[PDB]
Amino acid sequence: AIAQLATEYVFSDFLLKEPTEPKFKGLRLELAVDKMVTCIAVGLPLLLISLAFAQEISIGTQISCFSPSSFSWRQAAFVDSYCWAAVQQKNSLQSESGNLPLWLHKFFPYILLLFAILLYLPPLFWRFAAAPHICSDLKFIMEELDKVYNRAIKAAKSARDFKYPIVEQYLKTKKNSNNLIIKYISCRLLTLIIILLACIYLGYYFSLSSLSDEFVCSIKSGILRNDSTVPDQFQCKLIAVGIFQLLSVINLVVYVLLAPVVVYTLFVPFRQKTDVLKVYEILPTFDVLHFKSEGYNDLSLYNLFLEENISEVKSYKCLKVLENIKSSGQGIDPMLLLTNLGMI
Amino acid sequence: AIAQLATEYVFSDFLLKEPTEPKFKGLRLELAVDKMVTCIAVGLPLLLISLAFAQEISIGTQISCFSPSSFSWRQAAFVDSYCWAAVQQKNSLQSESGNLPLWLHKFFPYILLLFAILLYLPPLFWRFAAAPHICSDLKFIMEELDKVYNRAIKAAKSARDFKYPIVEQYLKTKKNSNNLIIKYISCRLLTLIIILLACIYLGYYFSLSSLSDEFVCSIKSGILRNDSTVPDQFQCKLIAVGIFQLLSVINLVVYVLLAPVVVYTLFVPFRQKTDVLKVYEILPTFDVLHFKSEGYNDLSLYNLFLEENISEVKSYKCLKVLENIKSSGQGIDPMLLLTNLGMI
Amino acid sequence: AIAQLATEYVFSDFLLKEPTEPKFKGLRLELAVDKMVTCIAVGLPLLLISLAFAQEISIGTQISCFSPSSFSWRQAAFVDSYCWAAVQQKNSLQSESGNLPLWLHKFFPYILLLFAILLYLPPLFWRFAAAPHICSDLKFIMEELDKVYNRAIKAAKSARDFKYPIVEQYLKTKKNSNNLIIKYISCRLLTLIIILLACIYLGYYFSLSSLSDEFVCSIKSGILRNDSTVPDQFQCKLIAVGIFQLLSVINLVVYVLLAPVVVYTLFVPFRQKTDVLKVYEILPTFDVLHFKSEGYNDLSLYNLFLEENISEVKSYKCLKVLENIKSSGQGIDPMLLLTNLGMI
Amino acid sequence: AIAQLATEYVFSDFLLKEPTEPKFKGLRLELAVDKMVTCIAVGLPLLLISLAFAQEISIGTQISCFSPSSFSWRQAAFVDSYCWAAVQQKNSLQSESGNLPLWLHKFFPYILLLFAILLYLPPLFWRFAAAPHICSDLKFIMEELDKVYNRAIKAAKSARDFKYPIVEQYLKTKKNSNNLIIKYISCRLLTLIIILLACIYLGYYFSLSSLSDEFVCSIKSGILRNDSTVPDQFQCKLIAVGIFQLLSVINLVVYVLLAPVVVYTLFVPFRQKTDVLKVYEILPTFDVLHFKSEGYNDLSLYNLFLEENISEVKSYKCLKVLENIKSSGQGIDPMLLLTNLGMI
Ligand SMILES: CC(C)CCC[C@@H](C)[C@H]1CC[C@H]2[C@@H]3CC=C4C[C@@H](O)CC[C@]4(C)[C@H]3CC[C@]12C
Ligand SMILES: CC(C)CCC[C@@H](C)[C@H]1CC[C@H]2[C@@H]3CC=C4C[C@@H](O)CC[C@]4(C)[C@H]3CC[C@]12C
Ligand SMILES: CC(C)CCC[C@@H](C)[C@H]1CC[C@H]2[C@@H]3CC=C4C[C@@H](O)CC[C@]4(C)[C@H]3CC[C@]12C
Ligand SMILES: CC(C)CCC[C@@H](C)[C@H]1CC[C@H]2[C@@H]3CC=C4C[C@@H](O)CC[C@]4(C)[C@H]3CC[C@]12C
Ligand SMILES: CC(C)CCC[C@@H](C)[C@H]1CC[C@H]2[C@@H]3CC=C4C[C@@H](O)CC[C@]4(C)[C@H]3CC[C@]12C
Ligand SMILES: CC(C)CCC[C@@H](C)[C@H]1CC[C@H]2[C@@H]3CC=C4C[C@@H](O)CC[C@]4(C)[C@H]3CC[C@]12C
Ligand SMILES: CC(C)CCC[C@@H](C)[C@H]1CC[C@H]2[C@@H]3CC=C4C[C@@H](O)CC[C@]4(C)[C@H]3CC[C@]12C
Ligand SMILES: CC(C)CCC[C@@H](C)[C@H]1CC[C@H]2[C@@H]3CC=C4C[C@@H](O)CC[C@]4(C)[C@H]3CC[C@]12C
Ligand SMILES: *[C@@H]1O[C@H](CO)[C@@H](O)[C@H](O)[C@H]1NC(C)=O
Ligand SMILES: *[C@@H]1O[C@H](CO)[C@@H](O)[C@H](O)[C@H]1NC(C)=O
Ligand SMILES: *[C@@H]1O[C@H](CO)[C@@H](O)[C@H](O)[C@H]1NC(C)=O
Ligand SMILES: *[C@@H]1O[C@H](CO)[C@@H](O)[C@H](O)[C@H]1NC(C)=O
């Protein structure tokens, strides 16, 4: 039913499932905006496919040819099925709009499924190629941040009663390499191109005259070519073509609204803001150097992933509340850190 | 069946499922009133869609055109399907009420699903954008309250046998920022606007003459335009239109009753009452300062979320019972706190 | 099937599911009588809806109009569907009993579902508004009782080899407030009113002549108004109306039997008997004062909830067996308590 | 399918599910004979309902009226559905056996479901009212038996290298109260009465002439009353009536065989034999006094429940093997108990 399709595709965790494995425990591995874009671009065409053939919206068979009254039920059924299979056969049918509109009307669900698969492909390539590496690197970075926070609080407590910036060096090294950012931009660009092509197709499909679904059909090949009792042609109409056009314009609207989001996503350096690591600069055990901005490198992408999935880090949360309290400046950062006692 | 739909949509945890993740363990992340509003506004139109096409209420096909007796079964089926697809084609049909009523009668389930999706969108945006931040902040606040309660009871026990207000400073800082409250008000306002538009549409749909479902249909395009055996027109009726109007007025009543709730929700500062933190003011380790009221800021929203999901805090419950006992004034707050022995 | 519906709605845990959350572990949060009343009042109309359209009891379509023999199958189907949709349209049909009986016959499942939803609403309001508070308070009370029992047995063992009545003070304070009892009485009263209205409706529906299901139908609007081959009217009958009346009288009987139960529930103070706390009065560490009776206050409701869900408390069970043994008076209460050794 | 129904209702744990809660861990809370009686009396009529309308045994529709050849398919369908709905309407039909046989033939599944529900009601009342109390009491009794066994074995080991009969006093007190036994006897008696009424009904239904399923039907009310082309009456037959009678006699046989079991159950004191507590009399720490027999009191019912669900007690099992070995008398009870070393 329509409501069942809605529950499956919008109100359920459709493509929102976290990786089912212990390797990525709590790691999104995909930005929220990218996940939203993929979920829409994939589950919208599927939802429209399901809707267009819902038991309520669908009168019945997808084509009716209006055989003569003399024709029996199965003769008329032969006519309808023959014309359905003959939309491909150009000789059999003669339609003013041509045969491409008939092909599109017959295979619209296939085309929507193709667009959905093509849009799901780049996210899958990301999740299967560049996701494990970033997952491992980000897990190491979070562990290093937790360890340095613990060491700093232990030092502060000892004072009240190595020291090498490994994480900073690793981030600096990531500043050079750009394979991950190149893959990310390539997959986003392919998604954008697929969306644009889908928009072109949907606009063309919705621009039809709405009468191209009606085509003339001739069961006059073979032994029936010279038969007399059979009329030379029939009036066939492809039902649900109006529904297809409505859903196609809906998908076109959604995709044109979505494309600016993908374009904004492509410009990762601009998105790289609100320095996540700036909060850690007040730790004595952490060097006061952010050095993450203004670069078409994997460093900006790692900064984005950190700003996305750093809320799960207790040390980061503690430092963030310390920073927020520092806005008033009533107290002292080391005193607040010592009082917090948030090692684990 | 009707009962199955009821069990799924009203008697089950439809959209009442808690976040399936360890990040939010026991945190609602959504006020009870907001959750009720979203659940109604989403699962009502879906329930009505399912009901309108229930196997019992539905006689059968959604349109019947009453072809002549001479017409065969599949000729009549062609007529019915053609008219169903031609509700869009204005030339084919001539109805007194126009063609918009026919469009609405055909696509009412789609319109209800659209309203449900549009009403579910703002809650989803909230849960995916502003929910993680408030979850982390509120978890930190609850942990700080538990820790300060433990410290105060330990101090009392030591007396019987830092001290910095970090949580108060954090709340004071939240008094300034307003991004969360702005997002909350924006999503509530969008929900209200969607509800009002849905009410307008449902009122228009229910105001129809009830005879607009009957339209005249002409299969007279193409080779059949000059055919003689076919009548110039047919009498088609869209079944289930009365059911659609009944369910639409039901939804209109529900939404007009719900809109005052959304308006009351918009005025969060008025809702900010019954100070949750007032109970903690009797703790020696906690400063006697509430400072949370009369502000279009995130502080009021945090106060609401605390008053919502603070019952899970054992320290808060203990302080609440101490406060309630203090109404009589027979005993002493520190003595009762020491006797409680409710560290964990 | 009928047996499947029975298993789902009477032999299964339909609305008998305990709260699926760790917050309420073993707490009913709903009295047994109230749960029975809600389960009946909700799952009876749903069961009757399912039964009335069971594949065995149902001959087929819900209306047959007996078109002339000259009419084709789909002409007759048009007639039947038109009349089904025209029960609303007063002009189309002319029935002796009127049009309200036809409306009721068509929408009886909807009306039963409406009554079920309206009866499920007050229980849901209770469980979502006043259940968390009573759950927290009752959990605290049980924990306090366990702690005082442990302290008393420890003192007895020490003798053989604070002391403040916090729980008693909390109960005394609850004696004043009445918001929970007011909400309980309001929800019970609304349930009673809904049940009475349902009884009125079912009595009216069952009082019909049983021939109102037969109505005269006229497909004579539009181009067919002046058509000659079509008869001026048809004889239509709404099938399953007898089944609807039978199930409606069954529901009426059940609801009239249930209403006295709801009225008895409304009088909570009378139900407040068999003092649960009287057993704890023999503990040296517990003050000898019950002070819970004769009040339209939340104290009586808390006493009811205690008498309901106190069997899970080991200390209460031990004190109950001590009390029962004290009926003979052969031994001594402190000696029996010491011998029991039931700390945990 | 038939085999699926059999698997669900006889070969599966239909109504044999243990209470899904930690409160009753391993406690039957229902005697084996009572559970068997309830399972049969409930799942037999449901199984017969399912069988009577199985896709294999069922030819098709439940009534056929044999309309004239001139009648079209949907005219004949109208006739059949009209007569199906008119079995209630006495004026419409004229049958030699009357109208009650037709009512019974139409609503036999409803009557079987009613009997099943009425037979399931007393067991449900027991499980929801008197089951928690007996569960708690019996758990306490088992814990006391385990503790006294442990104390006795510890004393024996100490000798080789309070003392109050709390459980005996509790059982003696149970000797007085009789509310549980009264509820048990009342529910068993109601089950017996329901079974007898079901037997009466099934005997009456099976005693029919087998031709009462054939009734004369007249679609001659309304505009068709004076119509000429329609015959004055039709020959309608209610299919599956023979299957209903066969299954009804099967159920009658099962219930008459079952009723003696219920009568034997009612006489609980006679069932109270094979003293379970007699084995514990050899323990030095346990007083040598059974005092459980010859009483219409809850003590006999508790003895039955003990004899039912005491096999789970390791101490009871050990004492039972000691008793069995004592039949030969080769050894000594205290020596065997010491050698067993079965504390836990
Ligand atoms: C997904 C991508 C590939 C879709 C590409 C656009 C498709 C949908 C449409 C839009 C415009 C279309 C073209 C419009 C006009 C003509 C001229 C005609 O004589 C042959 C077909 C041809 C050449 C069409 C082929 C298909 C076409 C290119
Ligand atoms: C992503 C955005 C830009 C998509 C917007 C949809 C645009 C591309 C659509 C809307 C209407 C469409 C046109 C409608 C009709 C025709 C005439 C046909 O003989 C060739 C294709 C052509 C010229 C279409 C090309 C694509 C088109 C211009
Ligand atoms: C969800 C929102 C967009 C719904 C907006 C209201 C819709 C349902 C209805 C209510 C009143 C309607 C209008 C009423 C009157 C007219 C004048 C007519 O000559 C053209 C259509 C037009 C202009 C209608 C368009 C659709 C309309 C605006
Ligand atoms: C949220 C609340 C205010 C909704 C209440 C429903 C209101 C808006 C509904 C109920 C009846 C409706 C009117 C019914 C009939 C017409 C005539 C038509 O030619 C234009 C629209 C118009 C004028 C409708 C406008 C909207 C309307 C006034
Ligand atoms: C659930 C509640 C609202 C149901 C209320 C009772 C319903 C079922 C029935 C019972 C008696 C009925 C009334 C009986 C008589 C008349 C007089 C007639 O000229 C108009 C309808 C009217 C006024 C009926 C309206 C509907 C009615 C009130
Ligand atoms: C909860 C208890 C009291 C419900 C008992 C059912 C009662 C209320 C039912 C049973 C028969 C019913 C009556 C049957 C017939 C008519 C005639 C009609 O023109 C007006 C309503 C009226 C007068 C009904 C009113 C309600 C009624 C009296
Ligand atoms: C479950 C219980 C209520 C069933 C009771 C027995 C039912 C099945 C049957 C068995 C015998 C039957 C009775 C036999 C004879 C007559 C005399 C006739 O002129 C009216 C019906 C009446 C009075 C019957 C009513 C229904 C009846 C009582
Ligand atoms: C539990 C045991 C005793 C049930 C045995 C079934 C008995 C009660 C059945 C079997 C045959 C039945 C009888 C068959 C026929 C008739 C004639 C009818 O006009 C009145 C009922 C009457 C007289 C039935 C009464 C009940 C009956 C005697
Ligand atoms: C049909 O008859 C025509 C007559 O002109 C002939 O040319 C043609 O070959 C025939 N077709 C078949 C399939 O026999
Ligand atoms: C139908 O016949 C008419 C006669 O006036 C002619 O004008 C029209 O073109 C014909 N239509 C078709 C589709 O051949
Ligand atoms: C039907 O014919 C009658 C003849 O009196 C006329 O008044 C009426 O307008 C016609 N109806 C239609 C819909 O053409
Ligand atoms: C049918 O015709 C008879 C002729 O005697 C008449 O008495 C009766 O009222 C008519 N019935 C209807 C429903 O018009």
UniProtKB/Swiss-Prot annotation, chains A, B, C, D:
Outcome of mutating R74E: Loss of voltage-dependence and anion selectivity. Strong increase in permeability of sodium over chloride
> What is the membrane topology noted in the UniProt record heading this document?
Multi-pass membrane protein
Topological domain spans for side Extracellular: 61-105, 210-237
Q: What GO molecular-function term can you cite, just one? A: scaffold protein binding
Q: How is expression of this protein distributed across tissues?
A: Widely expressed. Highest expression is observed in oocytes and brain. Detected at very low levels in sperm cells.
- State the protein's name: Pannexin-1
The record describes the protein's role as:
Ion channel involved in a variety of physiological functions such as blood pressure regulation, apoptotic cell clearance and oogenesis. Forms anion-selective channels with relatively low conductance and an order of permeabilities: nitrate>iodide>chlroride>>aspartate=glutamate=gluconate. Can release ATP upon activation through phosphorylation or cleavage at C-terminus. May play a role as a Ca(2+)-leak channel to regulate ER Ca(2+) homeostasis.
Gene Ontology CC terms: bleb; endoplasmic reticulum; endoplasmic reticulum membrane; gap junction; membrane; plasma membrane; protein-containing complex
- Phosphotyrosine-modified residues are where? Y170
Q: Which residues are glycosylated?
A: N226
Q: How is it modified after translation?
A: S-nitrosylation inhibits channel currents and ATP release.
Q: Which GO terms describe its biological process?
A: ATP transport; calcium ion transport; cell-cell signaling; monoatomic anion transmembrane transport; monoatomic cation transport; oogenesis; positive regulation of interleukin-1 alpha production; positive regulation of interleukin-1 beta production
Transmembrane region(s)? 40-60, 106-126, 189-209, 238-258
The subcellular location is: Cell membrane; Endoplasmic reticulum membrane
Q: How does it assemble?
A: Homoheptameric.
Involvement in disease: Oocyte/zygote/embryo maturation arrest 7: An autosomal dominant infertility disorder due to oocyte degeneration and death, which may occur before or after fertilization.
Q: What pairs make up the disulfide bonds?
A: C65-C236, C83-C217
The protein's annotated catalytic reaction(s) are: chloride(in) = chloride(out); iodide(out) = iodide(in); ATP(in) = ATP(out); K(+)(in) = K(+)(out)
Q: What is the effect of changing C318S?
A: In OZEMA7; impaired glycosylation resulting in the absence of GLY2 and the accumulation of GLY1 forms; results in increased hemichannel activity
- Note the InterPro entries from the entry: Innexin (IPR000990), Pannexin (IPR039099)
Query: In this UniProt entry, which residues form the Cytoplasmic topological domain(s)?
Result: 1-39, 127-188, 259-344
Q: Per UniProt, which keywords does this protein have?
A: Calcium, Calcium channel, Calcium transport, Cell membrane, Differentiation, Disease variant, Disulfide bond, Endoplasmic reticulum, Glycoprotein, Ion channel, Ion transport, Membrane, Oogenesis, Phosphoprotein, S-nitrosylation, Transmembrane, Transmembrane helix, Transport
Q: Which domain of life is it from?
A: Eukaryota
S-nitrosocysteine is found on C39, C318
Phenotype upon changing N309Q = Impaired glycosylation; loss of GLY2 form; oocyte death
